[PDB]
Amino acid sequence: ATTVGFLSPVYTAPAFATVTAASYTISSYLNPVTPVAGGAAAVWRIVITRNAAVTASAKTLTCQMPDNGQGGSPADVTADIAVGGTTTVCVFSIAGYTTATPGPYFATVNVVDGAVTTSHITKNFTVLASGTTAPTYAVTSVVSPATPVKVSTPVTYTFTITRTTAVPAGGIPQPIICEFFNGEGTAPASAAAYWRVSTTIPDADTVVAVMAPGETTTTCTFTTYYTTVSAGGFTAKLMVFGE
Amino acid sequence: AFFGADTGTAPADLAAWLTAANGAGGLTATILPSSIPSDIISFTRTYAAAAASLQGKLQCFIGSTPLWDPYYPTPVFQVLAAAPTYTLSASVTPAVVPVDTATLWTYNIIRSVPVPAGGPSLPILCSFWDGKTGAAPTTDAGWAALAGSANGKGTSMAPGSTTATCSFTPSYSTTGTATPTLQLIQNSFALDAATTVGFLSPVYTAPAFATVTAASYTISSYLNPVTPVAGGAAAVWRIVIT
Amino acid sequence: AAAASLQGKLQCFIGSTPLWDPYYPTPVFQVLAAAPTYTLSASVTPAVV
Numbered sequence: 109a110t111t112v113g114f115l116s117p118v119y120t121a122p123a124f125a126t127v128t129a130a131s132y133t134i135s136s137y138l139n140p141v142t143p144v145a146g147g148a149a150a151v152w153r154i155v156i157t158r159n160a161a162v163t164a165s166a167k168t169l170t171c172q173m174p175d176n177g178q179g180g181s182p183a184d185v186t187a188d189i190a191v192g193g194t195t196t197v198c199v200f201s202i203a204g205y206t207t208a209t210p211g212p213y214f215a216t217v218n219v220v221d222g223a224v225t226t227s228h229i230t231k232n233f234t235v236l237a238s239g240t241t242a243p244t245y246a247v248t249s250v251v252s253p254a255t256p257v258k259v260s261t262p263v264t265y266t267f268t269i270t271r272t273t274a275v276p277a278g279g280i281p282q283p284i285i286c287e288f289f290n291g292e293g294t295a296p297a298s299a300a301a302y303w304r305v306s307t308t309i310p311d312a313d314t315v316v317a318v319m320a321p322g323e324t325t326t327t328c329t330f331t332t333y334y335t336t337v338s339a340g341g342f343t344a345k346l347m348v349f350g351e
Numbered sequence: 352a353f354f355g356a357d358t359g360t361a362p363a364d365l366a367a368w369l370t371a372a373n374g375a376g377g378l379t380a381t382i383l384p385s386s387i388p389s390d391i392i393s394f395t396r397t398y399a400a401a402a403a404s405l406q407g408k409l410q411c412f413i414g415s416t417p418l419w420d421p422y423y424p425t426p427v428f429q430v431l432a433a434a435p436t437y438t439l440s441a442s443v444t445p446a447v448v449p450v451d452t453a454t455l456w457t458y459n460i461i462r463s464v465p466v467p468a469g470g471p472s473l474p475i476l477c478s479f480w481d482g483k484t485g486a487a488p489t490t491d492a493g494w495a496a497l498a499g500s501a502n503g504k505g506t507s508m509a510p511g512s513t514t515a516t517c518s519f520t521p522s523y524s525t526t527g528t529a530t531p532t533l534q535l536i537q538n539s540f541a542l543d544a545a546t547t548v549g550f551l552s553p554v555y556t557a558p559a560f561a562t563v564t565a566a567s568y569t570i571s572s573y574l575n576p577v578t579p580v581a582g583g584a585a586a587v588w589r590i591v592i593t
Numbered sequence: 594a595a596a597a598s599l600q601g602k603l604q605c606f607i608g609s610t611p612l613w614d615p616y617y618p619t620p621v622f623q624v625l626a627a628a629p630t631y632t633l634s635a636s637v638t639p640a641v642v
């Protein structure tokens with residue numbers, strides 16, 4: 109109460125500060141790289157990363173998908189970005205794929221936060237005709253040190269993943285994630301429960317790989333140690349999640 | 352004569368342009384002997400519409416000879432519903448300077464509406480008064496009279512970009528506080544001083560000021576005979592002050 | 594007063610028991626003729642953020 113200001117005029121700098129806008133980085137992919145005409149439903153996943161972080165709120169972004177690349181417009185998607193987070197995801201579920209238009213096909217996705225519209229032009233993709241099978245995947249395993257091993261002995265697993273049909277050459281990558289369960293832990297549940305929570309994505313249990321536009325084969329490599337003795341067991345299990 | 356997007360339609364016949372120019376809508380220009388340019392021609396057109404850009408056409412006859420084959424299309428221009436708003440901001444990198452020293456006074460300008468994308472740039476003359484010198488101009492005529500003679504300067508809005516940057520270097524002479532002011536006036540080639548009208552009815556003054564500090568001196572002594580004798584030579588102390 | 598730096602004396606007691614033997618001298622202070630002013634300059638290294 110009793111303190112007295114040293115300077116009567118409140119100071120203002122001889123210059124200013126320019127607080128610019130925050131840009132946006134949009135990247136999108138379709139989970140089935142080669143969807144069938146009515147064989148299943150395709151769910152486009154559209155990730156968006158902000159320029160900077162948030163301050164005591166959860167940013168609401170809106171995703172417009174006016175064009176399918178073949179004629180159609182489903183409802184928009186509302187997404188939220190955490191208080192400290194910078195990235196968020198929109199999901200667009202459509203199943204009515206037709207091979208009427210010759211192809212190759214592409215889409216455009218608009219993202220708005222403060223009424224500023226930022227468009228993203230999707231890469232090309234292809235759709236099979238009705239009645240044909242969806243190209244599945246196959247996985248084989250090779251262990252480097254080979255059985256029998258001991259406790260705390262280095263053990264390397266290599267999972268070779270192939271697709272029955274090559275990824276379309278028009279250009280779209282497939283982000284796959286190998287999640288490997290050692291056979292030592294608490295025996296996790298079915299694959300729906302295999303998606304555990306990881307701190308850093310290139311860790312000893314989760315690995316992220318990318319299937320290139322023109323390829324059909326890849327591999328994911330783990331190198332782990334073992335802790336307890338077991339005669340006749342320790343079956344290494346694996347799953348792939350496309351994200 | 353001329354027709355810019357104002358009333359009716361263009362005279363789709365060349366002789367129609369001829370009879371329009373020969374009447375009241377025409378105007379005469381004189382080119383004197385041994386001279387390249389013509390005198391300034393001025394038309395006035397009222398707009399009751401709004402919205403996007405427009406493109407007019409001129410036609411010009413010398414002894415019924417038509418310059419330019421169909422017409423001369425004028426540059427892209429746009430009519431607006433509301434007057435565009437100019438905002439300003441100011442900076443000094445040498446915030447405190449001594450007397451007789453250069454100081455960098457920078458301004459950034461933001462326009463409400465963008466410069467027409469298909470049209471030309473927007474040239475504007477900025478007139479800057481440091482605040483320590485004379486009483487400065489008060490009217491727009493005086494503001495536009497501040498030409499490039501170390502006091503005014505012409506900058507340009509890029510077509511489609513709503514930003515401007517301008518700079519001046521006032522070197523104050525007297526100590527204390529000097530607050531500058533700045534005025535923006537469209538710097539076209541037909542920029543008149545009698546009928547100039549500024550964009551900023553309140554002449555923007557930088558909220559801060561410039562501080563001028565007294566000039567210090569350095570002083571160094573030396574004397575000619577480093578071992579003087581008593582009564583034989585007079586000591587000469589040469590003192591130098593910078 | 595005016596001119597050079599000055600000093601004061603502060604002496605305390607508890608039931609006639611004296612704190613500090615002669616006194617406790619105060620820190621050096623100077624009395625001014627007029628209120629001094631402060632000249633301030635400001636800067637930003639990332640002028641655009």
Ligand SMILES: *[C@@H]1O[C@H](CO)[C@@H](O)[C@H](O)[C@H]1NC(C)=O
Pocket residue numbers: 211212213214232278279
């Ligand atoms: C996607 O499809 C269009 C239509 O034929 C094609 O012209 C274009 O080159 C493709 N996109 C690529 C691979 O750049």
Ligand SMILES: [Ca+2]
Pocket residue numbers: 287304305306313314
């Ligand atoms: Ca994990």
